[PDB]
Amino acid sequence: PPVPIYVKGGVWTNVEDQILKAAVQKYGTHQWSKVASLLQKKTARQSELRWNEYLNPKLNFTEFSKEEDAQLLDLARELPNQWRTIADMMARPAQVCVERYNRLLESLKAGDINPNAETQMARPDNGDLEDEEKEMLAEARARLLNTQGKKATRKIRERMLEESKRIAELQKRRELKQAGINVAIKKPKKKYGTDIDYNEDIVYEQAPMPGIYDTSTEDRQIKKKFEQFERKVNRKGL
Amino acid sequence: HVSAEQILRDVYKKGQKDILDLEELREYQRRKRTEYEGYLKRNRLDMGQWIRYAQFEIEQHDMRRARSIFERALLVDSSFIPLWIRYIDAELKVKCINHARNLMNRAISTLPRVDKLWYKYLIVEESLNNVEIVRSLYTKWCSLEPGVNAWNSFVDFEIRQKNWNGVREIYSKYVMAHPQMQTWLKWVRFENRHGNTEFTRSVYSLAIDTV
Amino acid sequence: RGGISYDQLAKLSYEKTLRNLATQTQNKVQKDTKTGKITIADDDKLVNKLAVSLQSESKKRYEARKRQMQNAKTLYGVESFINDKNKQFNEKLSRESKGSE
Amino acid sequence: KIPAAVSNWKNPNGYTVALERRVINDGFMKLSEALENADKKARQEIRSKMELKRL
Amino acid sequence: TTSHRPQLEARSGAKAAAYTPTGIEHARLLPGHTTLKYRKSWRKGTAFGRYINDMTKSEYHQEFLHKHVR
Amino acid sequence: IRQKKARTILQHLSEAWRCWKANIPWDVPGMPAPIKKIIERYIKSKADAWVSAAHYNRERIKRGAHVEKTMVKKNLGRLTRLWIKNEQERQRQIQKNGPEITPEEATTIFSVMVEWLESRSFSPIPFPPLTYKNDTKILVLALEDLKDVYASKVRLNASEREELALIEEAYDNPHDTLNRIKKYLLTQRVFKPVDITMMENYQNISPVYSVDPLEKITDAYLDQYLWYEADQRKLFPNWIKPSDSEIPPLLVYKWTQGINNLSEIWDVSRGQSAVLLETTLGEMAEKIDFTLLNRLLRLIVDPNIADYITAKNNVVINFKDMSHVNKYGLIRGLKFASFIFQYYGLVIDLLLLGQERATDLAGPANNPNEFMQFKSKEVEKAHPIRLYTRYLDRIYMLFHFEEDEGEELTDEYLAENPDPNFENSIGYNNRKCW
RNA sequence: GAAUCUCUUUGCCUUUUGGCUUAGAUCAAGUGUAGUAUCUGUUCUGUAACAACUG
RNA sequence: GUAUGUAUUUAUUUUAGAACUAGUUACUAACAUUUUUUUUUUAAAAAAUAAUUAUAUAG
C-alpha cells in the first residue's frame, strides 16, 4: 500500500538527521542497515555518507586560518586533484576543502539528481509536520524503546500470569474458609525425582561451630520469640 | 521543534509508564525460598544475594535459617568483610550477644590483619561496659605487632579509663614495637601533660641514650 | 584529600561511635569447667541500648540513601537516556570523565 | 581507575550512550616540480622545432 | 540475551566427588601398554639502459599474500 | 577488585580484539599503562595464532585436502582481513616514506612519451562536444554491458533494483541522462565509497570492486568514448594485445606462424641463435603514481577528462567494518580501467623497445603496419629484436643473433657477473610439462 | 566543649553494559479479507427557634 | 507446518469532563486460484494471433 521507492537518494531534512543521530547513539556506528531501516527514503550507504561527511562531531567545520589556506593552495599544487588525500592531510571533510578551494581560485537545475546531498546543509521543516514524518517518528520511538529478547518478554508475561493465578487460588480458599470448609493449599509438583521442597527441612543446614561462650538462654529467648510470632500470625494474621 | 534529545525524552517518558493465616505465610515462604535458592544454585557467587536471602529469613523471625544462610555464605567467600559485619549485626540487633561474641572471636582469629573486625569487637564490649574485656582485647591486639592505629587506640582507651600507671606500660612497649621519634615524642607529650618533671626527664634520658 | 584506605576509615568510624557512646552515656566472668563455657554476667540494659542503637543507625542510613535516590532521580541535566538504568550509567560516565581529564 | 567500557559493535542492554563518546614528505613536491619543468621543456623544444621547420 | 555468559568460575572437581559412580566401560580405557620400561650498437637506444618478530610484517606473510591475491 | 569489576575489565579485551580485526587502533583515553600493555600483549598472541591458522588452512585448501563448506567461508573471511591490512600498511608506508618514483625517472619517462606521441603526430582526444554525432549509439553500447548482468535473475536485492531503475530511466530519456554525464565529466571531483569483496578460486583469491550505480553509468560512457576515439586515432600500436580482431587461440596461432615466417630463423649453419623471452611485468597497476598518471595522460585526452580519471581512483575502500583511502593504487574495477592499463603498458613497451624499434614494429603513421610484418626485410634484420607482443601483464620478445653478437653480449654479462663454479644452470627455470 | 534537626562541596556509586566465529549470515517490491495498535475532527457545560414529654 | 511447553481431583484424616463520526498507517495470519505483437490521429483508424494448471514447502 505504499508504492515502492526503488531509488532512495533524496534531500536530507531535519527529521532524518535527528533520527539518524538518536539511532547512532543506540545502535552504534558499524551497524548501518539497522540505522537506515529506522528512517525510510534513505539507504544504508547514504546513512554512512551522512554520518562520515556531515553529522559527525569530530569533523572540522570552521573558517580556514591563513596557514591552513596557504597549505591548501600548496597541497592542491603538489597533488593534482586528489581531494581525499588532501582532505586527509587537513583533517577536514573533502567537500569543505573543494568549496574553499573554489573560493580561493575565484579571487543545479530542477529535476536533477543531486549526488552531493549527504554533504550539504539540512532543510528545516514546515510548522506542523507531514503525515509520513509523524509515522516515521512514531515507529522510530517504538524501535528505540525496546531492549529485550523474545525469551525475556515471555518471562515478563509468565510472571504476571502466575501472579494472578496465585491470587485466584487464594480467593477460592478464602471463600471456602468463610463457608467453613478448609481446603489446604496444594503444592507445585516436582519436575524430577529429587526436586527439593523448602519448608520440610533447612536444606543444607550449617551449624555455626560453637566457641567458648554460652548460648542457652539466648536460644530460649529466640525460641520464645519465634513461637509467639507464629501464634500471632495464626490468630491475627500478620 | 524536533531534535534528538526531545525524541529520547519522549521515549523515556513512554517506557517509564494479604497474609491472613499461617498457610498463606507458608506458601509465601516456600515460593520465596525456591526463588532465592534457584538464583544461588545457578550463581554460587554474588554475596549480595546471600545477604538479601539471609535478611529475608530475618524478616520471617526465623533466626536458625538466617544463621545457616550466613554460614553457607561465608563458606563461599571468607575474604568478604561486609558479610562478616552483617552477620555480627544480625546477631546483635536481636539481642544475642554471646552468639556474636563467638562470631567476633571467629572473625578476628580468621582474619587477624583486618582492622575493622577488631574495632567492631571493641565497640561492642565498650557498649556493654566491660572494661576488663576491652583491656584484654587490646592486649592481644597489640601482641601481634599490628601498627600504630591499634596502639593509639589502646593509649586512648587507657586515658579514658584514667589508669595513669598503665599508659606508661603501653608506651614502654610501644617504643619497642615502633621505633621512630614520633612515638617517643608522643610519650613525651603524655608525660608533660599527666606526669611529673622527673618522669618526663627520665623518659627524655631513656630516649637519648638509646638513640 | 582523596580516597581513604580501609585501615583509616575503620578508625574514624570507631572514634565516631565512641564519641556517640560518650554523649549517650552523658544523657563478671564465670568459667564452668564441666563444659568449658564462659558465662559473662551482662545487664539487661546496655544490651537493649546496643540493639536500639544499631537499629536506629541502620534506619537513619537507610532513609538518607532513600532521599538521595529521589534527589538524584529528579535532576535530568546529564544526558539523553531511554530507561531508569541508562541514566545511572550515563551519570557514572560523567563522573569518570570529569575527574579524569 | 579503569573507565567503563563502551563498545561500538555490541550494545547488550541497548543503552543510548552519548554521541560524542562512541565516535607530507618532500618527494611529492619534488616530483611535481620536475614534471612541470618537463612540461615547459617539451613546449620550448617543440616551438624551436616548429621554427626550424618553417625555415 | 542473558544466555551468553563469560563463565567467571569453573566446575569444581570437588563438586563431583561425593557422587556415586556408575561403571560403564569405555573404549579408551581397555588394557593397553601394560608394561613399564625403565632407565638403567643496439643496447644504446634505451632511455634507462646503463626476522622482525611480528608475523604480519614479515616476508613470509607478504610472499604468501602476494601469491594468493593475484 | 571485589569480583563484580572483573567481568567489566574483560570488555576491553573483547573490544581490543574487535579493533584488531578491523585495523582500528584501539586507544582508550583514561587507561592505565600496564593494563594496556597486558591487553596489547594478549591480543598480539591471539592474532599470531589467527594468522598461522589462516595460512595452514589455505595450504590444505590448495593441496586438495578435505575441507568443509563453512571452513572455506571462514578462511575467505580471514584472508580478506589479512589482505586489506597489508594494503592499508602499504598505503601508509607510501605516504610516510614518500614516492619511490624519484623525479629523474619521471622526467625521462615523460620525455620518452612526448617524443613518441610527436613521432606519431597524435591528435588528443577532446572533451565530448555538446552535440556529438556518434553519441546516442555509444550510449546504447555503454548501457548494454551494464544491462547484461541482469538478463538472468528475477530475484533481486534492492541494490540491483536500484541499478535496473537507473538503467531503465537512462533508456527512457536518453538526452537528459547524456547531458548529466556531460556535466559530471566536467564538475565532479569527489566520489562515493567503493566496496571491495573477495571471490575465491581455491588456488588464489581475487578482488571485486563494486561502484555506485550512478557513477558506473558515467564510467561506462567514458569507457566507450575513450576506446572508440583512441581506436580512431591509432593510439595503441599493433603489439598491444588483446586486440579486437582476434580470439586468443587465433593470437597464439598467429604468433607461432609468425615465428616461422621470419627470415632464416631456423637456420643455424653459422652458429647463430634465436632467443624467446617471456615474462610478467610484475605489479604494474599497484605501482601507478597518480601525479605521474595525470601528466602522462594529459598528453592524449582533454584536461577535464584527465582530471576525472585521476580523481575517480582516489576513493574510499570498504570491506565490512574497515575503510581506507586509496591513495596510491589503480583500482581495476573501474569501467575505464582497461584503457589506463594499456596506456601505462604502452609507456613500459616504449621503455623496453626504444624509439627506433617501436617505429619499426609500428610503422609510419601515414600507413600503419600489420601485427608481425615489416615494410621491408632489411628493416627486420637491422636489429636483434625481431618480434614483440604484450598481453595484459605479459611480454613476449623474440631475439635473433649472430655468433659474434651473442658472444659479446654474454661477455658483458660474465664480466659484471662471473660464475666460475658453474651454477647458472640451477636457478634456471624451464617447463617440466614437456 | 558538647548533643538534636537541616543544607553545601569532599569520600563512597551503592538497580551504575556478564562469552565465541565468516562485523555469525542474509534482506527488508506481494492482492483481498480479518485481528491488534494509534490519530484526527465536531458539539455541550430540608434547617433553626419556641411550647410538651424523658422512655 | 513442525519442535517444545503449558491446562485437565475424586475415593471427606478426628478440633477539565460529557456526547457524535469516519478513514490512514505499520505488524501478524498453513486463510483465500481480467491475454501477446504494434501502428495512426487528437474517442475514432489500421494490422495481428492462438477443447481448457498444482494438495505438492520447514529450522
From Swiss-Prot, chain B:
Q: From what superkingdom does this record's organism come?
A: Eukaryota
Which segment of the chain is annotated as a signal peptide?
Answer: none
Annotated compartments: Nucleus
User: HAT repeats located where?
Assistant: 27-59, 61-93, 95-127, 129-160, 162-193
Also noted in the record is:
Present with 2140 molecules/cell in log phase SD medium.
The annotated subunit structure for this chain is:
Belongs to the NTC complex (or PRP19-associated complex), composed of at least CEF1, CLF1, ISY1, NTC20, SNT309, SYF1, SYF2, and PRP19.
User: Which purpose does this protein serve, as stated in its record?
Assistant: Involved in pre-mRNA splicing and cell cycle progression. Required for the spliceosome assembly by promoting the functional integration of the U4/U6.U5 tri-snRNP particle into the U1-, U2-dependent pre-spliceosome. Also recruits PRP19 to the spliceosome, as a component of the NTC complex (or PRP19-associated complex). The association of the NTC complex to the spliceosome mediates conformational rearrangement or stabilizes the structure of the spliceosome after U4 snRNA dissociation, which leads to spliceosome maturation.
Name the family the entry cites: Belongs to the crooked-neck family.
The protein's name:
Pre-mRNA-splicing factor CLF1
Shown portion of the complete protein runs from 12 to 229 of 687
Swiss-Prot record, chain C:
Start-end of Polar residues biased regions: 20-27
Give its localization.
Answer: Nucleus
By sequence similarity, the record places it as follows: Belongs to the SYF2 family.
Any further remarks?
Present with 1670 molecules/cell in log phase SD medium.
What this chain does, per the record?
Involved in pre-mRNA splicing and cell cycle control. As a component of the NTC complex (or PRP19-associated complex), associates to the spliceosome to mediate conformational rearrangement or to stabilize the structure of the spliceosome after U4 snRNA dissociation, which leads to spliceosome maturation. The cell cycle arrest of SYF2 defective cells may be due to the inefficient splicing of TUB1.
Q: How does it assemble?
A: Belongs to the NTC complex (or PRP19-associated complex), composed of at least CEF1, CLF1, ISY1, NTC20, SNT309, SYF1, SYF2, and PRP19.
Protein's name according to its UniProt entry: Pre-mRNA-splicing factor SYF2
Question: Span of the full-length protein shown?
Answer: 92 to 215 of 215
UniProtKB/Swiss-Prot annotation, chain D:
Q: List the disulfide bonds.
A: none
From the Swiss-Prot or TrEMBL record, state where the protein is found: Nucleus
Q: What does this protein do?
A: Involved in pre-mRNA splicing. Associated with the spliceosome throughout the splicing reactions, until after the second catalytic step.
Subunit (UniProt): Belongs to the CWC complex (or CEF1-associated complex), a spliceosome sub-complex reminiscent of a late-stage spliceosome composed of the U2, U5 and U6 snRNAs and at least BUD13, BUD31, BRR2, CDC40, CEF1, CLF1, CUS1, CWC2, CWC15, CWC21, CWC22, CWC23, CWC24, CWC25, CWC27, ECM2, HSH155, IST3, ISY1, LEA1, MSL1, NTC20, PRP8, PRP9, PRP11, PRP19, PRP21, PRP22, PRP45, PRP46, SLU7, SMB1, SMD1, SMD2, SMD3, SMX2, SMX3, SNT309, SNU114, SPP2, SYF1, SYF2, RSE1 and YJU2. Interacts with CLF1, PRP22 and PRP46. Interacts with SPP382.
- Other comment: Present with 1670 molecules/cell in log phase SD medium.
Question: Which family is this sequence assigned to?
Answer: Belongs to the SNW family.
The protein's name in its UniProt record: Pre-mRNA-processing protein 45
> Organism, per UniProt?
Saccharomyces cerevisiae (strain ATCC 204508 / S288c) (Baker's yeast)
Lineage, broadest ranks: Eukaryota, Fungi, Dikarya, Ascomycota, Saccharomycotina
Q: What's the name of its gene?
A: PRP45
Portion of the parent chain present = 164 to 228 of 379
Swiss-Prot record, chain F:
Compartment annotation: Nucleus
Stretches that traverse the bilayer = none
- Source superkingdom: Eukaryota
Region span, Reverse transcriptase homology domain: 112-434
Q: What does this protein do?
A: Functions as a scaffold that mediates the ordered assembly of spliceosomal proteins and snRNAs. Required for association of BRR2 with the spliceosomal U5 snRNP, and the subsequent assembly of the U4/U6-U5 tri-snRNP complex. Functions as a scaffold that positions spliceosomal U2, U5 and U6 snRNAs at splice sites on pre-mRNA substrates, so that splicing can occur. Interacts with both the 5' and the 3' splice site, as well as the branch region. Has a role in branch site-3' splice site selection. Associates with the branch site-3' splice 3'-exon region. Also has a role in cell cycle.
Q: What else is known?
A: Present with 468 molecules/cell in log phase SD medium.
Subunit description: Component of the U4/U6-U5 tri-snRNP complex composed of the U4, U6 and U5 snRNAs and at least PRP3, PRP4, PRP6, PRP8, PRP18, PRP31, PRP38, SNU13, SNU23, SNU66, SNU114, SPP381, SMB1, SMD1, SMD2, SMD3, SMX2, SMX3, LSM2, LSM3, LSM4, LSM5, LSM6, LSM7, LSM8, BRR2 and DIB1.
The identity of this protein, by name, is: Pre-mRNA-splicing factor 8
Part of the intact protein present = 774 to 1207 of 2413
